Amino acid sequence: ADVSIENSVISLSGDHCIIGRTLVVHEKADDLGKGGNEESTKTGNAGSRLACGVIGIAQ
Amino acid sequence: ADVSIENSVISLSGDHCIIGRTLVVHEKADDLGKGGNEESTKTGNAGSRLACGVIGIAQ
Amino acid sequence: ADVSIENSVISLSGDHCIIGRTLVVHEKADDLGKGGNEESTKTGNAGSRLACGVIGIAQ
């Protein structure tokens, strides 16, 4: 029960909640990606990663 | 139960909540990404990462 | 129950809440990103990260 924090970065967040009766979403997209290069070295992913997309409802 | 904080950065946040009866969203996008380069080295992701997108409702 | 804070940065926030009966959102976007470079080294993400987007309703 001894914590030692140093030259480091820490971030938290609380709990999000949306409570409704009706949820509607309309979307039109026309020209999103037009030759966008992308590089990645030693990255690792555990959630939802995406380039040039249209989600609709992300959680 | 001894905490030691040093040359470090710490951030928190509380709980967000939206309570409604009706939720509507309209969206038109035309030209978002037009040759945007992107580099990443030793990044790691655990949430929702995206380049050049249209979400609609992000949580 | 001994806390030791030093040459460090700490930030908090309370709880946000929106309570309504009707929630409407209209959006038109035309030209957002036009060759915006982006670099990242040793970053790490746990929430919602995005470049050149149109959210609609972010939480």
Please explain how this structure is put together:
Chain A has strands at 2-4, 9-11, 16-19, 22-23, 28-31, 48-51. Chain A starts with a strand and ends in an 8-residue tail after the last strand. In chain A, 7% of the residues are buried. Chain A has no helices and six strands. With 59 residues, the first copy, chain A, is mainly beta. Chains in contact: A-B, A-C, B-C. At the A-B interface, strand 1, strand 2, strand 3, strand 4 and strand 5 of A face strand 1, strand 2, strand 3, strand 4 and strand 5 of B. Strand 3 (16-19) of chain A pairs parallel with strand 3 of chain B. Chains A, B, C: Cu cation binds at residue 26. Chains A, B, C: Homodimer; non-disulfide-linked. Heterodimer with SOD1. The heterodimer CCS:SOD1 interacts with SLC31A1; this heterotrimer is Cu(1+)-mediated and its maintenance is regulated through SOD1 activation. Interacts with DAOA; the interaction is direct.
Instruction: Write down the oligomeric state.
Output: homotrimer
Query: In percent, how much strand structure appears in the residues of chain A?
Result: 25-35%
Most strands sheet of chain A: none
- What would the principal axes of the Cα set say about the shape of chain A? flat
Residue share in helices of chain A? under 10%
Structural class of the secondary elements of chain A? Answer: mainly beta
Rg for CA atoms of chain A? 19 Å
Query: How many beta-strand elements of chain A?
Result: 6
The helix-strand sequence of chain A is: EEEEEE
First and last CA, distance of chain A: 34 Å
- The helix tally of chain A amounts to 0
Show the largest interface.
A-B, 59 and 59 residues
